[PDB]
Every structure is written in structure tokens, then in C-alpha cells.
Symmetry: D2
Subunit: 164 residues, 4 copies
């Protein structure tokens, strides 16, 4: 496979329990736990960007994410991210000429990887393949399919991303 | 019409380490229920995936006749995107055989599995199932092995039993 | 001897809900642990509450006492939040109608449905305690037995400790 | 002085299904590292439990010699509360053997294990470890099997291989 760069921006996928909080915080990146047992053949590296809930991201934050992705010489990019503003980040990156040669896939999980019954590990496998296999562009890989960010919204009534 | 989600992927299960499960009776692992069905239960899929049983043999005990029946089931599917979960010991044999079937020419057919049973701690299974479902949807028509976060050409691949990996010839 | 298990909620039973963007008190985790415990003996589970123990009032503890008093069983396990486990245990230890019973409170500092949880160990340990201890009221946590009158939850330490 | 938590329990490990783990070399389960150590890492214990490896043979491979070596290790512990994790197939034989040693008269010695490996989904292991730790602390001196959420008298217990359960002899 082509070299894959993974950026971690936080989200439910990375949530972990803290006694002090009496609840979940955004913890260490769950993608690193999945890849530790994936027996990878190829070149993959993981970079920490942010440990935020995506609800708390500003236009400034999205701009910083785009410049960070442009710092990678890799042409295949996975960004793990909260689902609540995944569409906004993806649309923002889709507009950056500097990223036009890259395949950039955003993913995450509706249930924390550290909670029972999580979609995280499946989503990570699916999104790593998507980052390696899709043509240049910006995509959301969730629910075992590929979404066009310009034509996607998160439907909270369904608990899924859906096309517009 | 209101939007209908397609179900473009079909999964077949042929057993293998991925599906092993502990049985008191035997004091060890047997080939059990398909682990791929457990991963997809919590994957919050937009579509559905039809999962069909073909076999629960060890991939070491496959004959001509077993490989031929897998070819018919895959050939008869309406879907053009197919994942076959399978033992790793003879995954190359099965993949090479399916490569020779003109009836599969318009289909993307991916074989995958796991070096560690899904029901054992520290398993590659869930990652490999996500990666392989993506590969089955995104690769051009052909027959592939998706393992170790990469895609292998069956004609140019062997299983290294001692090293626990697929590798190039 | 027959064991009766009451569930009053707590961290042990927390589960994720998409609606909440976080944890809520979910179904009792003790039922998931006992499902695979291959039990030989008579055990039954009753739902009492799904609160964070922080929201428990005197009336809440009173309802819990009457429910335990409805059980003919002499071996009782109560799963519960850790934050007011001492208050509930002290209240039950004052009820003459429960004097013949061994009543053990337990729970977990990490939710059973979160990785790295003490829940399953705590449930095994507490079920043994409920069956093996003399009549009384006890907290079983950290692999030992606490006397409620002489115990506090030290949030700085993250453990129950003697006073 | 400031309060010191005692460590009144010692754990010995003799193998068994509880400790099984998958090995690619073998294309199956072997007796791996002691699973009790994994349970106690996340148990938030007040004390500290010393865990001592005695054996990794399958319980069916135990000799008289092996049982004797286990009795000498248990007898030499200073702790009066002892848990021995073990295979279920010959747990009764090891338990009966220990029950005959005068050296163990003042100790509460509990044998436990699991019908399903701790590293396999749906395992009884973690429950059984919590139960057995409590049993080793709370039971009077003697030798016991703690399985299925109850305490067995080794002299009046058999392993039902078919049902994967310990049962009384009535
Ligand atoms: N509030 C979370 C929701 C999620 O990731 O599913 C986030 O956007 O970070
Ligand atoms: N806040 C929780 C803490 C715990 O159970 O550990 C409760 O009392 O419900």
C-alpha cells in the first residue's frame, strides 16, 4: 500500500472514562489501539492534532486542520474526528486547493471505541482502505459507505449521516 | 420515490481462524458462528449486508469440490461486490481458483480472515472486516486478498505459516 | 443459600447514548456478569432504581430499605453508585427488620461497559461476601470489606478508606 | 503511624483453561500468561497481591510429584489466605491432596479456574477470580473449590466433564 498518514482530532471515537469527571472525556486516540493489533504490512503513522469534541471547533480550528493536513507529504490521509461537525470540517477541506492531489477521508464512531458495542474498529478498517483506494478528494467514511461532504448531513433522528 | 439505501455488498463465510470459538466438549477451539456477522451487527450500516454460510471446514481440509461450490455461490450472487471470509492456510488456493472463473469477470471479490480468532483478545478480525468490505466496494473487478491493511494479488502471494503473514513471492 | 440482588444504578451500570452525547445509567451490569458465571445456586435480580447515587434522598434510601425488607432471602447484594454508597449502607445498618440478613453493597469506579473496569471482579467478590459474611451491612470494594460506620469515599484517592 | 494496607492474600498459578491464549505457531490455544494477573491489574485493590507461578502444564499432565511441589510452595507461604488458579480437569485431585497436609491446617486455601479461557469472549474467569479471592479471605481454614458462585468440599465433589461443571456427590 501507499504511505498513510492519520491525524487525530478527537470525537466520541476517543472518549474514555475519568473518575474525576464522573464521565467520559476525549482520551487517547482509539485508532492507535486498533492499528496495534492490525498486523500492518505497510507504512502508517499517526499524528495527534486535537483532543476536542467537534461541537467546540471554530473556523480557526478548521483552518489549522487544513494547514496541518497540507504539512503531510503523504497523498493518503485519514482524519479521525467527532461526528457533530465532521461535515463542516470535510466541506472546509474540500475547498482547499493545496489538498487537491490528496485522498482525505474523515471518520469516527457514534459509540466510543472503549465502550461495548462500538462501530469504531470496523470504521477504522473501512476508512483506512477508503484513504488508500479512493481518487483524490475529500470524503466521509461512515456506516460502511462513502459520503460526498457537499451532499451529506448528520441526521440526529436516524443517528446516521445521510445524503441530502 | 423516497430514497432507498442499496445493499451492494454480499458476504460469504467459509470458516477459518476468524470464526473459531471455544467449546467445553472439545477442550479447545472449533470453527463456530461467523464472526463477520458480529462485527456488522454494531457497524451502524446505511445499507444491509446479506451474509451466507458456505462452510465451516478448516481451510486445510478444502478439496477441488469445496473450491468449486464456493465458485457457484459467488457466481450466482446478483451483487458485483463480494467478501468471502476464509481460513488463511488455503486462502491463496481458493483466491487463485476464483480468478479462473469467467463468470466472476464483472465482480470485485475479496477474501479476508484473521490471524487471531475474533473471539480471542487482541484480534485483527474487526479491522480486517472493515478494510475488506471497503476493498470489495472500491477495487476494480478481480479477485484479491485483503490482509495486513493492504491488497494482495493471489497469483503473486503466498501464506508464510511460520511468519504468520501473507507475503509476495 | 439463596442470594437476592437489587440494582439501584451507579457508574457500574453506565452506558453510552447517542441522544446524551455521553453516559446514562443503563441496564444493570450485574445481569451481564451473572449470565456467563455458570452459576450452580439460586440467584434472582430485582431493579430498584437507575440514579446516580448523588441524587439519592432520605426517601430514596427508605424505599431501598423497604424493598430489602420485602425479600425473604438472608443473603443480599445491592449494586449502587459509589458517591452515596456509605449513606445507604449506614441507613440499612440501622433497620432492625434487616438484622438477620447479610447485606453487601458494591459497584464499580469504572462502568462495566467501559474497557478496564473493576465491575466483574467486584461482582464476584461481593456475591461471595453476601454469602459468606455474618449478618450485618457491609461495603465490598477494592478486594476487601468495609464497615459502613467507619468508612468514607476519598475522591482524591479514588478509593473507599477507613475513617 | 499512617494506615498501612495489609496484603493478606497470596495467589499461586498452576495453568488451566483460565490461562489459555491463542498462538499462531500452534494454530490453537496454549497455556499462556496467568489471567488472574490481568484481572487484578484493573481491580483497584486496597492491598497488593503477590502472584507466583508454580506451573503451566495442563491439569491432566499433573504427576504426584507435581502435586507434592505445589503443596510445598503453599505450605511455605506466610499468608494464611491462598488462591491457587488451576485447570478444572484435576482440580479435585489437587484439592484432595492439599487437604491431607498438616502444614496447611491454619490456612484457607481456595482452588479456582474457568470453564472458558479468560482471553475468550463470554468467560466466567473474572467473576470466578473475584468470588475466589473473597472465599480465600472469608472461609475458615481448609481446602475448597470455588466455582459456579459456590463453595465445594473437595472430598464430596466431582468434575462432570460432559456438563463442564463441578457437582456434589450425594
Ligand atoms: N459530540 C461528539 C459526537 C461524536 O463524535 O459522535 C463529537 O462530535 O465529538
Ligand atoms: N457518580 C457515581 C460514581 C460511581 O458509582 O463510581 C454514582 O454514585 O452513581
Amino acid at each position: 500500500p501507499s504511505p498513510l498518514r492519520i491525524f487525530t482530532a478527537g470525537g466520541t471515537i476517543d472518549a474514555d472514562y475519568r473518575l474525576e469527571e464522573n464521565g467520559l472525556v476525549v482520551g487517547d486516540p482509539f485508532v492507535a489501539e486498533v492499528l496495534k493489533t492490525a498486523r500492518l504490512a505497510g507504512a502508517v503513522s499517526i499524528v495527534a492534532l486535537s483532543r476536542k469534541d467537534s461541537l467546540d471547533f471554530t473556523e480557526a480550528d478548521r483552518e489549522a486542520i487544513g494547514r496541518a493536513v497540507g504539512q503531510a507529504v503523504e497523498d493518503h490521509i485519514l482524519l479521525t474526528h467527532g461526528t457533530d461537525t465532521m461535515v463542516e470540517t470535510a466541506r472546509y477541506l474540500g475547498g482547499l486547493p493545496e489538498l487537491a492531489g490528496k485522498t482525505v477521508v474523515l471518520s469516527g464512531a457514534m459509540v466510543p471505541g472503549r465502550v461495548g458495542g462500538s462501530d469504531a474498529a470496523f470504521n477504522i478498517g473501512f476508512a483506512c482502505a477508503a484513504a488508500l483506494m479512493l481518487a483524490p478528494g475529500v470524503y466521509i467514511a461512515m456506516h460502511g459507505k462513502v459520503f460526498d461532504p457537499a451532499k451529506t448531513r448528520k441526521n440526529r433522528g436516524l443517528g446516521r449521516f445521510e445524503p441530502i
